[PDB]
Structure formats: C-alpha cells, structure tokens
Symmetry: C2
Subunit: 264 residues, 2 copies
C-alpha cells in the first residue's frame, strides 16, 4: 500500500525560491518518515508535467507536490496532489497560493509619496501568478494617482532588462522589476552610467533573495515566504492523504521589506 | 530487479554548491530514465548517513550518491556508491574530489604582491577538504613570504565571523574567508565601520556564488565547478552500476576568479 515516498516536481533548481520551498517540504515530510522522490523539469511543458506525475504513480508514491501549470481537459490521477506557486484558482485542486495580489499592492506602497511615474518591468502576463501581481500593482498605482508604464521583459535575461530600464530611467521616478536578481543588474548598470539609487530613481525587486542585503544600495523587496509555502504544501498534502477532501487553497502572506533602494 | 531510482544525500538546495551538484547529477541520470530519491541531512552524524543509506537500500535504489563523511569501521553497503565533496582519500570508495589543494594555492595567488599579512578564516580542519585547502594556503603563503594567522571560525555564523574579521582587520593587509557569503558579510560589516575593500584590506572568498558580481567591491573567489562535480559523480556511479570496479577518484579542476576585492 504505502511507499512512504512523496513525489515532488521542481522547475528551477538554481533559484533559491524553489530551494527554500523544497527545504520547507522536506522538513515536514521527513519528520513523518517520508522520503522525497524528486523530478526536475527542463521546461514548463504541461505534457512533461503529466508524464512526471504518471511516473510518480508508477512508483506508487503516496502523494505528489508539484509547481503549478494549467490543468488540461484530460488531466487525471489517483494520487493525492498539492500544487504550489499557484494563482488563486477555485478548482478541485488544493493549491498553495502566495498572496501575489498583496505583493503587487505592497510593491507600490514601498514607493515614496512623491513618486509620479513608475516603470514596471514584468514577466509575461500569461503566467497566472504574475498577472495577479501586476494587476494589483496597476490598481494601487491608480488609487494613488501614480502614472506607470508596463514593460514585458525576457524571462531569462536580467542584463538586457537592465539596459532597457536604464535607457528610459530619466523618464521615471521609480522602477519596479521582476525579482531581486533583475534589481541587482539594474543597480550594476546604473553605476556604469554614474546614476544613483534612490537619488535618480527608487528601485523595488521581489523575492527577498539573500542577495538583497549584500548590494549597494540594499534592495527593497517583497518576501514570498518560500519556506512556509513548502511547509504548508506538505501539511495540506498530509491532510489529503488522511481523507480530508477539502479543496480550499492556502493563502500565504507576503512581507514588504524596506531597504536602501527606496529609503536611501 | 532495478528500480531506476538513485538515492542522493545532500544538506539542502540553497547554496550554489549543492544546488549545482544536484543539477549536474539530475541532468545525467534523468537522461537515462532515472529518478532521484533524495534524503536531506540535518547534520554530519555518520550514523544518520548510514541510516539514510540503509533506507535507500530498503527502497531498492540502483545506486547512491552521498556527500562525504568519515567511513566508520562497520561501514557496509551492497549498492554502488559514489561520494562527492570528498578529500583525496585512497580507499575503496569512488570519490569525486575537487582540487582543494589548487583552490587553496590559487587563493593566496589572488592577493596582490604588496600583501604582507593575511588573516585566513577557516572551518574546522577536522573537515578533510578544508584541511587540504588550508594546508595548500599556508604552503603557498610561505613560498611567497606572506605572513598569516589561521583562525577557526563558526560553520553556521557568517555574521559572527565577519565581526571577528573586522575586529582585527587593522592588523592585516588582506583577509581570506570560508566562502563568498562570509566574504559578503565582511564587506557589509566593513561598510558599517567606514572601511573600504580593497583599500584597507583585500578579500578573497570561495564558491563563486552569484552575489560575487553584485557586491561592491565584486568578490575575488574560487569556482570549484559544482555542476561538473555532480555530472561526474553521476557518470562514475553509472560506471559502477555497469561492472566497472575501479575505485580511483575523479579530480575536478578549480578556477580562480579575480575581481575588484583583490585589485591593487
């Protein structure tokens, strides 16, 4: 019956965000005698996700924890499953949802009351979690009468994104970008151009990656609580494996952290 | 019968070192249809390593890849095994050995010719790989007539190590510490005390973490190519699983990287 194995799918192993989610998962499941059977994805192909899930089932895992992907019409499995890094989707799958809406709202709230124009660089809005974040940003910006420009940026090139940001920086009072690595690249390019942050413009990133406290200026950001996302995914999975049929989503809080990139 | 599962033991996936080692391992084994069964260690208890190994065997894994630990007198295993993050030990266990000797030697060579006294912070020499690194450092320092002070430092406290380093920095021309995170903490503490690097003293880290290129100054360091360490561990394991009984170790080259923290 039970294998005491939990299947886990992780998309980006080198991102400390996913590293911390896995750390949260293992902390909870290993205490209960489970061992993680982990599959690393090469890309976000839904078919590959389904295939990974099928292989987990062939190995008789007792439960599965996977990063989110759009549920296809033919989706099917007979193993308890929890989806993390998900948007607040009200379907039959238990999802661990970071409060992306609060994240976006708080990103705008980190800006000075004197900010009149902000450049918002973002990943494709086709990504549900990003759409939630950006829609909340434009809503709060509108509430505060802060003009903005949305700019979709590449998903794997912080350098190019930083050039685009600096090229138009004199048109903005602040810049909000996709994550802290992208913010770090913006800081590096600003220095190449002899521009100062926050003097010439305020800067806000996302994640609260360890990098934030080591740059100059330090980076203002939003902490996504990845460890808690992981721990919660594990607890919710254990509940499903214990006969709890609830499909309610767990909403994980996000925390705004003010550093020198906004405060000076 | 084969399970097409490979047991892997690692502390976690946060640091670049372990995340990249796993990246290297998974890249090679998934290509061959294997799935990683990963046990995360909470400490360096040899007994816990042995128990983790027994659990993998009870799960019929086809091979095991683990971080290094001192082999106890009663060590016994009937499953192919490869140890990474190992010193160059000539026993019957296949080990993937980073060239710690070269790493230590090149760390001293990163210092400017003007450097006369260096503070060398290191983890306990009871750790074989660190002993190899430090012994190479003192050998090269002696060759170049550079005076030095060896200071054992905490393994889980970059902050405390940074305070110790700065409290006596006035007595040194350069400081070499355990890794780039520790180096970053030193740069941060140096800023708190209105001291500049390399101005007041040069600095060298280890690991070539992503943050090296985003700090001010950028950090000179040693890249031990963890992805290659992982890929090699997987290749050697597949060889053992193929009847190749050689127990010779694989030595992996390192690459010193000069950045602004050692610019004279």
């Amino acid at each position: 019956k039970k294998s005491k194995m939990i299947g886990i799918i992780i998309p980006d192993l080198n991102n400390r965000f996913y590293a911390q989610i896995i750390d949260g998962i293992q902390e909870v499941i290993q205490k209960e005698g489970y061992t993680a059977l982990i599959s690393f994805s090469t890309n976000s192909d839904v078919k590959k996700y389904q295939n990974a899930i099928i292989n987990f089932e062939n190995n008789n895992v007792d439960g599965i924890i996977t990063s989110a992907f759009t549920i296809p019409p033919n989706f099917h499995l007979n193993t308890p499953l929890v989806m993390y890094d998900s948007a607040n989707i009200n379907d039959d799958i238990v999802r661990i949802v970071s409060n992306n809406t609060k994240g976006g709202k708080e990103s705008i709230k980190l800006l000075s009351k004197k900010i009149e124009k902000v450049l918002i660089q973002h990943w494709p809005l086709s990504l549900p979690t990003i759409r939630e974040r950006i829609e909340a940003m434009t809503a709060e910006a509108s509430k505060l009468k802060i003009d903005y420009l949305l700019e979709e940026t590449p998903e794997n090139n912080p350098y190019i994104s930083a050039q685009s940001a600096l090229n138009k920086s004199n048109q903005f009072d602040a810049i909000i970008t996709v994550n802290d690595l992208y913010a770090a690249e913006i800081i590096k390019e600003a220095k190449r151009r002899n521009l100062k942050i926050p003097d010439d413009f305020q800067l806000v990133g996302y994640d609260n990656n360890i990098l934030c406290g080591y740059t100059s200026p330090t980076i203002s950001t939003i902490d996504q609580n990845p460890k808690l996302i992981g721990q919660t995914a594990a607890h919710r999975l254990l509940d499903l494996m214990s006969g709890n049929n609830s499909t309610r989503n767990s909403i994980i809080d996000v925390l705004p952290i003010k550093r020198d990139s906004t405060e000076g």
